[PDB]
Amino acid sequence: TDMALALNRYLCTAVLPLLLFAGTEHHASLIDSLLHTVKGCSLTKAQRDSIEVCLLSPSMMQHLLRRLVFDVPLLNKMPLKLLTNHYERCWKYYCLPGGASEEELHLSRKLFWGIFDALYEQELFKLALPCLSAVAGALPNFNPQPVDTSNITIPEKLEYFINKYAEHSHDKWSMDKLANGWIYGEIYSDSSKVQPLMKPYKLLSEKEKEIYRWPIKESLKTMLAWGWRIERTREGDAAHGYSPRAIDMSNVTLSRDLHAMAEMMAENYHNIWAKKKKLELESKGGGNHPLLVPYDTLTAKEKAKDREKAQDILKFLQINGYAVSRGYFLSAASRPLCSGGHASNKEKEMVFCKLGVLVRHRISLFGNDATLHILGQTLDARTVMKTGLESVKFLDNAAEDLEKTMENLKQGQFTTTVALLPMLSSLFEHIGQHQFLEDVQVSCYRILTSLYALGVERQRSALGECLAAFAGAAFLETHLDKHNIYS
Questions:
Q1: What are phi and psi of 384, to 5 degrees?
Q2: Which residues does 174 contact at the CB level (< 8 Å), separation at least 6?
Q3: Torsion of CA 203, 206, 208, 211, to 10 degrees
Q4: Exposed site from 72, 77, 125, 443, fewest CB < 10 Å?
Q5: DSSP conformation class of 331
Q6: What's the CA gap between 69 and 73, in Å, rounded?
Q7: Within a 13 Å sphere around the CA of 149, how many CA atoms are in the beta-carbon half?
Q8: How many Å apart are CA 427 and CA 441, to the nearest integer?
């Protein structure tokens, strides 16, 4: 407490020093200062020390534009909502000069807009949904999840592999040190450069293989843990003492199957060593260690024994020739899934989720101002809501008509069976409540003139009589929506 009053006063004194490799600690450590409050009112000044510290950096800030994206999925309080969505629009600046992670940006877009069905509160989620059109327009907590390795037994085909890879290991323990060539003695006198461990491989015993054997078996058993395995293909490949005719595993190029598994093997090693660090010094009276931060931020220099050691276990597999196997693109490839995913979210506009009608539809307007396959299904997307909430065309979704064609204004002005009958089906659902309500006819006028900016035969004399029905029904302001579509 009495030294925990340091944080209270320094919410301004560590701010005024506001006015690219070793600065990664503040994107890791100081990101967790406000995360302790994610001092009460004074924590809002920590946003000014962070939401402005990201934009004018962008080397490690390129790895911090989606920093809390490993915890923005675990947002929901109010500071967990503003730790991402307020820095969402500023996350296009890092990939502005740089425009492996373009599919990870949709993880907090296809779920947080679905978590927008769980909640004023959407004052920060609305413009950040258009920042997802900017994070894909400029380029184009986090708990470790441990898995236990030794549950399975060593397969017999990879026992000719644990004796060849360990035989190469004592070469690789010397190929990094062959310019000096260190040898065994009896006493560890490192002033005269002798090691007590430099013994050859062909004179090994039943309890000294385990220095070589155990890094391989924690690197082989964890391949079978994700529904993946190893298949078969064709075959392939001074001084004196233990002098080998060896080859290096820092110049052999890899396969494309192995990339998503070996970078997951470091993610596997981000869930073993990030748990093996919790079993060494914390039970003796230790303190708080910062390695529980989000995933794309923290230092990787300890992981050089985990990112460069999780590839040569399977670079050596390509020596043996074994078939390692895995069995704005995503904003466009899932866009027909999105127009079918928002229309499936159009049925719940009648029965929190009524804000989901406005959090999903009105945010794709700039996405339609930046881009009939998905647009012809989006013309009838609100025709599921104006049929499901057809009695009221249900709290906010009964009066979401003024924002309904507002996303179809930018979609209609930005462009023969996918538009023939259904162009005047949802449009008449706006002009059908024109003189019941005037928030539907004010958007139907921009729906009837949504073709004069892009250039309804059947709906020409149904609205022309409706112009002759609402000529004085003010519904004369609703007459300009039914008189602009009668020829």
A1: -85, -35
A2: 181, 182, 242, 244
A3: 120
A4: 77
A5: H
A6: 7
A7: 19
A8: 9
- The full DSSP string for 368-407 is HS---TTHHHHTTTHHHHHHHTTT----STTS-STTHHHH
Cα distance between residue 410 and residue 15, in whole Å: 42
Q: What are phi and psi of 177, to 5 degrees?
A: -130, 25
Q: State in Å, rounded, how far the first CA of the chain is from the last one.
A: 77
Tell the residue number behind the tokens 């944080």, with chain if given.
7
- What resolution in angstroms, rounded to 1 decimal? 3.7
Q: For residue 347, how many C-alpha atoms fall within 13 Å in the half-sphere facing its CB?
A: 3
User: CA of 373: how far to CAs of 80, 333, 447, in Å?
Assistant: 37, 11, 19
Instruction: Provide CB contacts within 8 A for 364, sequence distance 6+.
Output: 133, 407, 411
Q: Spell 123-136 as b/e; 16+ CB within 10 A means b.
A: eebbbbbbbbbbbb
The residue type of 377 is Q
| Alpha-carbon span 345 to 306, nearest angstrom | 43
Method of determination is cryo-EM
C-alpha–C-alpha distance, residues 285 and 282, integer Å: 6
Q: Which residue has the tokens 């220099």?
A: 301
Residue 77: alpha-carbon gap to chain centroid: 20
Residue with tokens 């940006």: 105
Question: Which residue, among 310, 301, 371, 312, has the nearest Cα to 339 in the 3D structure?
Answer: 371
Type of residue numbered 464 = G
Give the residues across from 231 on adjacent strands: 323
Specify whether the CB–CB gap between 473 and 433 falls below 8 A: no
Radius of gyration of the chain (CA): 31
Residue 146 to residue 143: CA distance in whole angstroms: 9
Q: Is the CB of residue 193 less than 8 Å from the CB of residue 182?
A: yes
Q: Name which of 421, 332, 349, 331 is nearest 379 in CA terms.
A: 421
What is the spatial distance between Cα 389 and Cα 353, in angstroms, rounded to a whole number? 13
Residues in the chain: 487
232, β-bridge pairs: 322
- Is the CB of residue 432 less than 8 Å from the CB of residue 390? no
Amino acid at 392: V
Q: How far apart are CA 235 and CA 162, in angstroms?
A: 18
Query: Looking up tokens 């600690």, which residue turns up?
Result: 25
